[PDB]
Symmetry: C3
Subunit: 336 residues, 3 copies
């Protein structure tokens, strides 16, 4: 429990919506778990009308990858800011204690890197996000956030202490975007990141997003990119929102056990239709599929989901169960 004397392990991160391989309950003692992330500023196409965002990311994606450790472990992150970027960046882990979540110890200009270590002494899903002095909201709404999941060493439990397991974990980052429009009513397109700043701050101040998207763009988690599962399988759905409130809902399903405030030492609530993720936090829900078909997983402000983008799909294979639901009479002429 002096970290300098514990065993170290290096973890290879994977892009959302997947989550790197990890153990739930573990017999291992505490470890220093080492991760590396490289910041990439890049222009991204965020809708099907050609709208672009002068975006800023951890590891090339929105959200950044999910990092998974166990309660008692130490997180050790090397943060790299290449010389091909234009702005300075840093990282604030909501799961850490002190120095503005680590931000004060990780201020890196383009061409620099830094390494931070902190004790992950609290279980739960926590946001991590960039927070450079003087430009915090701009870096966060441009894409710089992701989740740290700290699992209890004994794995997740229900309100009575019974063991809960998941077969697969998915991570969904929800981003309220503020794209400026010009006097012709079209969204603006900037040559550089610094040029989008002033216009973007004015839109931010109205508190009305132009778009609200899951994982970087409208329909990101649809079509070939839909989430997948099978009847009988239990999924863990991690949902982060670093700037604004959201209310997740699984259409045709439920939140079997949900930690909406995302902290695993608290008992979960069961049978939720819709849950609430406070801006500045990550929460987690378990669901075991009982019916096959296409589900929608969305923010249940329905204008925010269908008009502004905050909706994805989960394609589930398996056998239909008529005891749970059955069409008694299909659509047909009204008896006259």
């Amino acid at each position: 429990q002096d970290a300098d004397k514990l065993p170290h392990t290096k973890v290879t991160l994977v892009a959302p919506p997947q989550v790197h391989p990890h153990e739930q309950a573990t017999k291992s003692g505490p470890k220093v778990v080492e991760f590396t992330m490289t910041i990439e500023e890049k222009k991204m196409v965020i809708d099907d009308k050609g709208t672009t965002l002068q975006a800023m990311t951890f590891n090339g994606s929105m959200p950044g990858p999910t990092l998974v450790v166990h309660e008692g472990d130490y997180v050790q992150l090397t943060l790299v800011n290449p010389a091909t970027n234009a702005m300075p960046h840093n990282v604030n882990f909501h799961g850490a204690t002190g120095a503005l979540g680590g931000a004060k110890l990780t201020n890196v200009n383009p061409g620099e890197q830094a390494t931070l270590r902190f004790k992950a002494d609290r279980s739960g899903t926590f946001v991590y996000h960039c927070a450079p002095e003087g430009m915090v909201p701009w870096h966060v709404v441009s894409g710089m956030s992701g989740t740290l999941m700290v699992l209890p060493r004994d794995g997740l439990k229900d309100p009575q202490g019974k063991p809960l397991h998941y077969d697969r974990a998915y991570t969904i980052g929800e981003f309220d975007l503020y794209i400026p429009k010009g006097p012709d009513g079209k969204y603006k397109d900037y040559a550089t990141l610094a040029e989008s700043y002033g216009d973007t701050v004015q839109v931010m101040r109205t508190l009305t997003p132009s778009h609200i998207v899951f994982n970087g763009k409208v329909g990101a988690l649809t079509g070939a990119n839909a989430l997948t599962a099978k009847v009988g399988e239990t999924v863990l759905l991690i949902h982060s929102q670093a700037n604004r409130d959201t209310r997740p809902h699984l259409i045709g399903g439920h939140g079997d056990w949900v930690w909406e405030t995302g902290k695993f030492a608290n008992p979960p609530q069961r049978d939720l239709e819709t849950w609430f993720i406070r801006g500045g936090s990550a929460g987690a829900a378990l669901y075991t599929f009982k019916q096959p078909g296409v589900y929608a997983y969305l923010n249940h402000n329905l204008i925010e989901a269908f008009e502004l983008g905050a909706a994805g799909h989960i394609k589930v294979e398996g056998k239909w169960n008529d005891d749970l639901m059955k069409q008694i009479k299909a659509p047909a002429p009204i008896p006259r």
Copy 2:
């Protein structure tokens, strides 16, 4: 527990704010409970300035009627869409499992009907709402939603398992409306439902409602239409909001026991001043009146309540209790 072999019972629905007669705790075994609803598109006057809404409803009201069953029962709904309507409709029960809550099995064009059955295996208050492919938010904000209440077979309980009862139940549906204005600054009035569409979607995208009303219009639950009760009586207040968050509060009273996320297998919280109903959900509060007089029951964003409409009244008869509250000195000149 094969539904095809259980006894069937037909229930006659009643308009909000009342709730059809039903048992709380019951000794009956599971049943297939049959209900019928007819969709009615209609223009409604929603304020005291003559503003109209091209509205869409279940059974002629906003919200639609509350359907009440017990955990373990099956809900069997016949959904009718008359030929006098212009749009196609369907129904998504958040209390059901599979096929987009039943929406995929109930798509009815004008002149058609369908019958769906599902197992009500989770206790709580759940939203049901229309959700036609391509126009989901418009149908919901135009009035198509209501609540399904699934009671535990043993009735409601407190955190310690003690029995809780209500003498009367009221259902309140809260609707964020997006009425378009023309270039003269007045709200528009349309000859048909289809003509209001495009203008309405543009207002919806601003995320700013023009009006927010309880049960179909400003002041719906006031005057001759105020809710009523007596000192000593315990009321159940069901509150649904299918699209946007709300925060109910009883002025002069409290939420004695509240399930804000609306799911009865979870323990309730006590003594709440103000609770929170996530958009896309229904929640429930119990209160036993201890003082007579006129109470206000409202959304405690006070601009939303007093300026935009989200407020009602409860008139309570009985005896004033000076031990709970007493005027020591009435308003009078300040001692000089």
Copy 3:
């Protein structure tokens, strides 16, 4: 427990962010606790650009002072409205039962005073606010609200019934302000309170605040006015928001035990990153500092905090703990 036969004690109130001296657990039996407050309408400078607010306050401050009693006690408030004010006022205690929280018994015109007594029979942090018939939202968003804290007679407890203590309590009132602008794009400045009314109601109806501030102005709880503490000290952070939702977060810290709905007979949640205060309520969090340095305490809609004002600082003295957090490698050139 007839209040007319209990001992009376008078309490001297202190300005926010401090809270008057009081006992947590007490051996005393119930008391009638007497307080006095004087309303002061005044113009206030609310930002660093000279913007003014035609404000309305309890006791000269935003928020008004926090009143602290114990469960079972009676609150007896004398409310004074001097003749130098222009409007009528009253008080609604969310902690009281009946007569619109006391508002119906305390309507005082300029030149009048009144005295109300009520039983504080429910533990928790509760909002109190002004609510004059016909102008409720305007008086509340102009500054008339504060908190009543009713402590359990045995002091605060955790979910298992273990005793929890605080060494110091701070009270933070968060105010969504709606300052009108004129046709030249500058904020308006009014000669009198009544002149600001009509313009202000039009801004309120957009539901978009111009500014969101802690304790009366942008940066109120910064610089010489930062909150203070030491490593090892446990602080109680009371947060009220009488009109609009907010989501408090301590940067570099956590909510060790939090009652977000603010009612102490309910078990608290632990390890929160960010909590939620519903508009129309007050909530409370405990935190024991483990690291020295400057923390930010803010609403984690980051545009609301950094662009609109809802952020303060806590300066903490003590010794840095490298086991909780350590810079392994400071910012330096990337290895080529």
